[PDB]
Structures are given as C-alpha cells and as structure tokens.
Amino acid sequence: MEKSIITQKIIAKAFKDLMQSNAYHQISVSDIMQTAKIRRQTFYNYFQNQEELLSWIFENDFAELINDNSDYYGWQNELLLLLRYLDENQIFYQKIFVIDKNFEHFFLIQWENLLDKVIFDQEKKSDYHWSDLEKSFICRYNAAAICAITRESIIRGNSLEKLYSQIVNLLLAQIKIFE
C-alpha cells in the first residue's frame, strides 16, 4: 500500500535507516523526524513511541512482501524479495532479536503466512491430493525450517539470498509428491 500510509512509510524508512548505524535505544523520536525531514510533532499523529513504530514496521513490511501484490503465481518472487529485505535490513533484525524476546514467535508466524501463500498459489496452478492435515504439516514443517535457518543467518551476519535456490528447490520437491 502507498497512498493511505505515505507519512508512516517515510517515518519508518527513517527509523530503519538509523537502525543500520545506531543502537535502538539511542534513536529518539527527535532523531527519527530529523532524518525523515518532517516536523517532530507529526510523529504523534501516527505513533506514540518507537515501540509502536517497530510494531507497525513488522506488520506492514512482512505483509507487503508476502501478500500485498497482484500476482497470480507469486510465491517464488515473494520469497526472493523477503530474503533480500532481510539481508538489506540484517542489522536491524539482529538488533530486534536482541531487544524483543517475542519477535521469534512473530517471525515464525510470518514464515507460516508465506507457506500458506505457497499452498494458495500452487492450488491455482495444479491439482493436489493433500489432505487438510497434510497441508498443515507441510506448512508448519517448512515454516519452522526456514524460520530457524534465516534467524541464524541474520544473527550470524550470513547472506540469506545465497540460500534462495536451495530453499525453492526443496520446497518444490516436497510440493511435487502431492500431485
């Protein structure tokens, strides 16, 4: 989305930029709005504080990457863009894994949402005999794997995009047996 959230997106970009090179708690609202080039008080039309801004970033950015697009068959492109986003924002996310103990659970749910999208898109392309139980299992199994691998890579400072071909290939192999 763009038109209904223009200012929020500018403020969030500013914050993400500062998180590349400053510790989270040393970024004030004043700093964010200086970087955004918007009058400070405007921040409060939208967020009470930096925690609320973080929450918004997590909800918006993952939805935008996974769901907010037009594509009929999109999951492979979405996965690539998600890995690229995590690489670009690796320092931000390393920091969040330190600051927010509940983030790991949110992160896993994001991967689950991606797997739900994989299933959604595949069922548009081909016919499958997977039961409801089997679809749940494939999603939970793979979401857990990708969550663990990408969390570790983020924390370690290893590139996520380098894993893309291997992840796609393993997912497609598993999907195929249910044709």
Stretch that binds its own copies, among 12-20, 66-74, 76-84, 165-173 (CB under 8 A): 165-173
Calculate the alpha carbon distances from 150 to 76, 99, 134, 154 in Å: 16, 18, 24, 6
Q: How far is the CB of 171 from its own copies (least distance, A)?
A: 9
Written as six digits, the tokens of 167 are: 């992840």
Site for its own copies in 91-150 (CB under 8 A): 134, 137-138, 140-142, 144-149
Q: Which residue in the set 30, 34, 169, 179 belongs to the binding site for its own copies (CB under 8 A)? A: 169
Angle formed by the axes of helices 75-88 and 132-156, nearest 10° = 20
Euclidean distance between CA atoms 150 and 86, whole angstroms: 8
170 makes contact with its own copies (CB under 8 A): yes
Q: Does 179 contact its own copies by CB under 8 A? A: no
First to last CA, the chain: 35
Residues interacting with its own copies, by CB under 8 A?
134, 137-138, 140-142, 144-149, 152, 163, 166-167, 169-170, 173-174, 176-177
